[PDB]
Amino acid sequence: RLVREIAQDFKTDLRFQSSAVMALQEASEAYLVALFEDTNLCAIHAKRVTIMPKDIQLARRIRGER
Amino acid sequence: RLVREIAQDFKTDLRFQSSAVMALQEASEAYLVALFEDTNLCAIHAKRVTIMPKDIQLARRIRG
Amino acid sequence: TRSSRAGLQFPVGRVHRLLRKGNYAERVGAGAPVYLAAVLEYLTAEILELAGNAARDNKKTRIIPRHLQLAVRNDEELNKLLGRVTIAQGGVLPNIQSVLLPK
Amino acid sequence: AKTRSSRAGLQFPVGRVHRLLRKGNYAERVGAGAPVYLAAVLEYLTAEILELAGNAARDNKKTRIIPRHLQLAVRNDEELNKLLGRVTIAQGGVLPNIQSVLLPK
Amino acid sequence: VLRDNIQGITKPAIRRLARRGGVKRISGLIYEETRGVLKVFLENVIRDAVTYTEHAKRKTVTAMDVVYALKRQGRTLYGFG
Amino acid sequence: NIQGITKPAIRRLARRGGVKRISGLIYEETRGVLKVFLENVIRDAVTYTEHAKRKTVTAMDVVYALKRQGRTLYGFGG
Amino acid sequence: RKESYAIYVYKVLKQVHPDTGISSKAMSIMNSFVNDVFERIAGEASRLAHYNKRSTITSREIQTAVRLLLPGELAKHAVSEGTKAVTKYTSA
Amino acid sequence: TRKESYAIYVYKVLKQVHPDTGISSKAMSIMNSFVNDVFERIAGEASRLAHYNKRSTITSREIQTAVRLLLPGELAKHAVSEGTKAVTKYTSA
């Protein structure tokens, strides 16, 4: 349902193959798991154990995602 | 001399165009400036002011 | 000349030649070279506009790679377009972090 | 020997490789040894993965290779990981890894 | 019949995604920031995907359109083509 | 050879990047990163010269190696 | 003889800033930029043809390719300037 | 509609290496995408090499140097060895 909302803002009256949604979910979760790996490394580097929004922002800054 | 040294380990009796070396120097310094930018951001994230090798190692690990 | 027929400056003929001599498809359309050249001419106008403004700011007439670097990096979209591109003799933007500033 | 695959001792179809290389708009003309040599590289890389995948299948005590086995196989190899570094395998997961500082006392 | 629902939940899911990533302690603001990253990521991928459907003259976004869109986004994915 | 980039050169590269205080081990760590970076780029550059049957690496080979290494560079060719 | 888009970069420059110049290094940087954008669009359009089982690169391949490579506003203005130029060419 | 794939040949290589093992449908399509990816990477790099050297044909030299670029050291060494063996074996017969 979330992806349907995002697509409605791009083009109206769209249908999705069930395999298209599953592929979107696969790449999304893999991106988020990998991001939390980099996020956890940043938090440990700051002599901390708890992840914080500054850790994710630092990770995406190093990746070049602005 | 450094680039000739590194290339000597790949193939013997090589000549370099002067523009080829300048292009290597341009890309090398730009990579190093960009790396220290990410390095300084990492050091500041650790509540520090001085950059340290652990900052570069973390930055290049996140960069892949 | 087909470039004059479209009001464009970039050579539509040279674009059509390079599209055929590059092995991208069996055939090349007639409107594609005009439309590819127009995008190129627009993007060059975008850069040259911001480069000339940076040249005026530095009080210099001739555009140097410093002007191109400043022009591309001050634009949010030109920076995203050329994000994986290094300009020779371009340098970097003046940026000092807040914590590093003297207090 | 009628099929060019038999003439090269390869399993992958040299004819289909030659067809797809011509029907893909990469160059005007196409060499004769390129389809044989491209198929050999493809067959070697698939054999390398299936080898490590079959080993991971033996470790997991399963007869059929599942995407978990491919993920474990590719990422445990130092070179296959660099080749497929920008690739995510469906239903693959991640390697078990817990940082040292995160471990209990 | 009361209804009144919303979308973009993923409240415990961000906790499960953290465990597979190896995270031990999660701050409260991580979840909201995590949702924002997922929005931008989906916006980029779906944009390139929708563009292929526009070029293909179709009203249905196929799994392939997602694949090359992920391919264009440097997020190559195996399994769906 | 590798020690030809030391003391102020590693300091000047830090100033353009915005670094204020530099630890002592940065200099050695910087050389190692630059070594690996040059090894990768020159390797792909030499590979093109091997295919082109030439004993001279042209400016293109450097550019094309950087393009394959995701380090696109403008200024030294088309 | 080595070809380039140099003389046309001069023309566009004078149309926008008549009292400005360009250096040789900055000109070669502009040359590589034009060729880079050239290869990206033509490469993406080539993929679009293969993906849709087509053998020709028409206006639609270029248009959707510019939609993919440029971020929003530059893509919006590029499609507008191009479709304007193609319509003017189609007239005469 | 006929759907082509490298499926039956992945089975042969699998049985040739591990005769007592199987593969799932999802993992099978994953292997298919792997073959197509490596296909496009090498063919794309060889296509660039042809344009770069002012040639109109992609020969064995373009494929060999393309694999030198894409594979990291050991995978490249073994790929060149297996390929040059097959090309010599093909040229013989």
XYZ file of C-alpha atoms in Angstrom, chain F residues 5-6 13 17 22 24 26 28 32 34 45 50 52-53 58 64 69-70 72 75:
20
model
C 55.239 12.817 -0.760
C 55.746 13.771 2.881
C 46.371 18.227 1.012
C 40.197 19.325 2.643
C 46.824 16.173 11.872
C 51.478 11.720 13.195
C 48.140 10.105 9.099
C 52.001 6.873 6.664
C 49.236 3.536 1.841
C 47.462 6.623 -2.259
C 45.607 1.901 -17.522
C 48.587 -4.046 -23.404
C 46.495 -1.512 -27.817
C 49.997 -2.962 -28.421
C 48.727 7.903 -23.272
C 39.705 5.591 -19.478
C 37.248 3.049 -11.776
C 34.280 5.408 -11.321
C 35.484 10.335 -14.401
C 40.240 18.024 -19.234
